[PDB]
Amino acid sequence: TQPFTVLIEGNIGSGKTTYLNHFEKYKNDICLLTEPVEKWRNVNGVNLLELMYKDPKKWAMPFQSYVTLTMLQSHTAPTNKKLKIMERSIFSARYCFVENMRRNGSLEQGMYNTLEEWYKFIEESIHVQADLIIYLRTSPEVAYERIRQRARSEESCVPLKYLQELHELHEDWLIHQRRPQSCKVLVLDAD
Amino acid sequence: TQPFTVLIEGNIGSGKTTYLNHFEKYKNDICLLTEPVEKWRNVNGVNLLELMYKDPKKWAMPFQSYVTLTMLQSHTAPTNKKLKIMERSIFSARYCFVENMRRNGSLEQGMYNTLEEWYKFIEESIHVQADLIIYLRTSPEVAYERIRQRARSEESCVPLKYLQELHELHEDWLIHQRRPQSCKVLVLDADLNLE
Numbered sequence: 001t002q003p004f005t006v007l008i009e010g011n012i013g014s015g016k017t018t019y020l021n022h023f024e025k026y027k028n029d030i031c032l033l034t035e036p037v038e039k040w041r042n043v044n045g046v047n048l049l050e051l052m053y054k055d056p057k058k059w060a061m062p063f064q065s066y067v068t069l070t071m072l073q074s075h076t077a078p079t080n081k082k083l084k085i086m087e088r089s090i091f092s093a094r095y096c097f098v099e100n101m102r103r104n105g106s107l108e109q110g111m112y113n114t115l116e117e118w119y120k121f122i123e124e125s126i127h128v129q130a131d132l133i134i135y136l137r138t139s140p141e142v143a144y145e146r147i148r149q150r151a152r153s154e155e156s157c158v159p160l161k162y163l164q165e166l167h168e169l170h171e172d173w174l175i176h177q178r179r180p181q182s183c184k185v186l187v188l189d190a191d
Numbered sequence: 192t193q194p195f196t197v198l199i200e201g202n203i204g205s206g207k208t209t210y211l212n213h214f215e216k217y218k219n220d221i222c223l224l225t226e227p228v229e230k231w232r233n234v235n236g237v238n239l240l241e242l243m244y245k246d247p248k249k250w251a252m253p254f255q256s257y258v259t260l261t262m263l264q265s266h267t268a269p270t271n272k273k274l275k276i277m278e279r280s281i282f283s284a285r286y287c288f289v290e291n292m293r294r295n296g297s298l299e300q301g302m303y304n305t306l307e308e309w310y311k312f313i314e315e316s317i318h319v320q321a322d323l324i325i326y327l328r329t330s331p332e333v334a335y336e337r338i339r340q341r342a343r344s345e346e347s348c349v350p351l352k353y354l355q356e357l358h359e360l361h362e363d364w365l366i367h368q369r370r371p372q373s374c375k376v377l378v379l380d381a382d383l384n385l386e
């Protein structure tokens with residue numbers, strides 16, 4: 001079982017990290033799970049994040065596959081705290097990042113299908129705690145800015161086009177669509 | 192949630208199907224799960240099995256991942272029979288087929304790694320019922336004949352060396368490197384023409 005869980009969603013460079021760094025001083029009453037980027041950067045030695053951004057058509061599949069795994073581990077990790085805040089989720093991994101990779105051709109149909117089958121099996125079994133989604137809404141330009149200020153080795157080549165597509169997907173999912181009673185969405189202007 | 196389970200393992204062309212047919216008649220007391228191969232041939236329209244054999248460096252990883260999923264589905268499927276018989280398992284996929292694709296160079300480090308991490312997680316979360324393993328043991332040459340006469344479209348380009356690698360892998364797993372926390376193992380002579 002999991003306590004009240006909050007999912008911090010948003011584009012790359014939407015200030016999620018900075019934002020949830022605030023909650024750090026309260027780690028004693030709140031379970032804080034940042035994106036397991038360190039895991040993605042070091043999978044038994046390999047940097048999947050790096051490989052994916054360097055050669056999407058080749059590494060998008062294994063990468064998103066691992067991301068699903070680690071997000072799933074985070075969603076199901078037990079805790080004694082009564083509040084849980086996670087940076088991003090399996091929902092955004094599926095509806096935004098994977099879908100985007102399918103559109104730009106990084107994921108070949110059979111690869112997209114495999115990932116979708118996994119998402120279906122998970123939802124059919126492993127229930128995921130999601131009570132609140134705070135959506136740090138931004139504009140691609142501002143997101144591009146943040147990314148540029150912090151020299152992230154892997155994100156050193158993400159085009160503005162890429163951010164726009166991710167942005168649109170986050171919009172289609174969190175705003176231009178009725179949400180279930182099981183989960184509320186709080187939109188904040190990041191910019 | 193799972194009853195006594197038997198995993199039927201063997202190389203490609205070891206007569207699993209034929210052998211599993213002898214169990215059709217007991218369908219009332221036995222839950223028989225066949226390899227979800229036809230699912231692999233139809234993943235919402237795409238034939239992952241074909242693609243895997245056609246260009247493993249690109250498709251081995253997605254294919255095996257879907258295999259894991261489908262096998263996992265069988266390992267945890269509903270049943271109301273007091274005996275369960277599965278054709279293959281996540282174990283043969285992990286220790287034989289994935290290992291083979293790693294050795295032959297089809298799976299690059301990160302892909303093999305991703306696959307292995309899923310295995311760790313699957314067994315840390317779920318528990319897979321495995322009480323006995325029946326091993327239809329054959330020689331790679333005999334297995335090659337079966338595959339040849341079977342004439343399966345996707346296996347059309349499977350060379351003897353491939354079956355040779357898989358054979359060694361099954362041997363190491365079910366016989367040599369075997370240990371007393373043993374899932375008990377019954378070794379059958381699948382070179383026999385029909386038992």
Ligand SMILES: Nc1ccn([C@H]2C[C@H](O)[C@@H](CO)O2)c(=O)n1
Pocket residue numbers: 012013035037064067088092093094097098155
């Ligand atoms: N499903 C996901 C989740 C995150 N990321 C990437 C986007 C950023 O580069 C980094 C997070 O800041 O992780 C990704 O490619 N796919």
Ligand SMILES: Nc1ccn([C@H]2C[C@H](O)[C@@H](CO)O2)c(=O)n1
Pocket residue numbers: 203226228240255258279283284285288289346
């Ligand atoms: N983990 C697995 C399981 C099966 N197969 C292949 C072997 C045969 O070609 C077909 C099963 O009869 O699927 C495979 O490549 N990998």
